[PDB]
Design a protein around this ligand. Structure first.
Ligand code: ZN
Ligand code: ZN
Ligand code: ZN
Length: 77
């Protein structure tokens, strides 16, 4: 069988870790801060990373490109 390449990622401890599956989209759970009282969920895009850190062992964390802080136009158009 041919080898299956998996990407690498920086663990939260900052070491380089091998992903065990490709990044996959997820719900972003961050809370928003706009100068008004608006309440709402971040629409993303957010992704979750599964990896096996040589230091930390199995670990995961989520990253999101949505706007969490800023003006009312930036957070909630
Ligand atoms: Zn680590
Ligand atoms: Zn987000
Ligand atoms: Zn606002």
């Amino acid at each position: 069988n041919p080898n299956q390449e998996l990407g690498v990622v920086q663990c939260l401890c900052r070491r380089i870790a091998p992903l065990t599956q490709p990044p996959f989209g997820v719900r972003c759970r961050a809370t928003l801060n706009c100068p008004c009282d608006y309440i709402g969920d971040c629409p993303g895009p957010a992704e979750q990373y599964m990896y096996r850190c040589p230091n930390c062992g199995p670990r995961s964390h989520v990253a999101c490109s949505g706007v969490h802080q800023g003006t009312c136009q930036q957070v909630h158009p």
